[PDB]
């Protein structure tokens, strides 16, 4: 075996590792390494996703911590019922940390994109919501915060779809089975561990992160609220790439930022005399004026189930993380009364 000059293991479809794993496909990659589909010939050629981390110290050490998280999840979920992706193996292959997991279907972002960003139906949003709440409540009870929840990291167990229509327009598609798993625990942080200051992907990042006020489990709750909005409408709640504009959007959509948070933040440059600095009649001003309205305005129906969805989402999107709904509380929200018995377990 050998590495390339970037520290990737030099490998191709056709190659083996551990006299066990046969590489049969590529699943994706990034600056961390690569993920390949393999057949596990010690487990009857079952399919796995194998993450092969680069032979670079910072990525190796990060992967060690990822493995520790995945071990805890496995230790605590013996019936495999909390819907976190299941690690089947890990090893150090010539300095490359390798982590083997269950091979699942398309992620919920990919599926939305393939559906031309037409949203998921409400019962689908509801079942996925319930599942996210259940999975993360489990994580949260084990002193863990994911920190990078986003539709790309929520995977369908099976993403086979049914066609509703196919007019000679884009094909309107619905997933047949809305069972999901939470993936990518590479940023997950135990309560006692060092907390990276800026966590989450932009669109799913909460105000206490932006304002550098400290964060914990409520971070994930905010992300989930953002994700549900996106599943319900097909577009992101916060389409921005800059902190001040993001905070302004939060205020336009959700109401005023609590004064105590503004007094406490080291990010004073975004404020003046307690209010966000924002020129509302500038080009960006008009755009935020045009596109960012109060949260309830985005409802598509006035019916009870929609009203309930938006109440839960508002509670998930509370500015103050200490006021934000917990996932234990969320699981008891009336929105979930509309689940079926099959869905409800």
Residue numbers in the entry: 136 to 303, 305 to 481
Authors' own words:
These phosphorylation events are dependent on SR protein (SRPK) and cdc2-like kinase (CLK) families.
The main structural difference is a change in the relative orientation of the N- and C-terminal lobes such that CLK3 exhibits a more open conformation than CLK1. The difference in lobe orientation is likely to be an effect of the inhibitor bound to CLK1 mimicking binding of the ATP cofactor. CLK3 also shows additional secondary structure elements at the N and C termini not observed in CLK1: first, a short hairpin comprising residues 136–145 that folds above the N-terminal domain; and second, an additional helical segment at the C terminus formed by residues 476–481. An additional hydrogen bond is formed in CLK1 between the A loop residue Tyr331 and His212 in αC. This interaction, however, is not conserved: in CLK3 it is replaced by a hydrophobic contact between the Tyr331-equivalent Phe326 and the αC residues Val204 and Lys207. Most notably, the alanine (uniquely replaced by valine in CLK3) that lies at the center of helix αG is packed against a strictly conserved tryptophan (CLK1, Trp419; CLK3, Trp414) located between the αH and the MAPK-like inserts. CLK3 is abundantly expressed in mature spermatozoa and might play a role in the fertilization process (Menegay et al., 1999). A greater role for CLK3 as a SR-specific protein kinase is also suggested by its stronger preference for arginine in P-1, whereas CLK1 shows no preference at this position. Overall, CLK1 appears more susceptible to inhibition than CLK3.
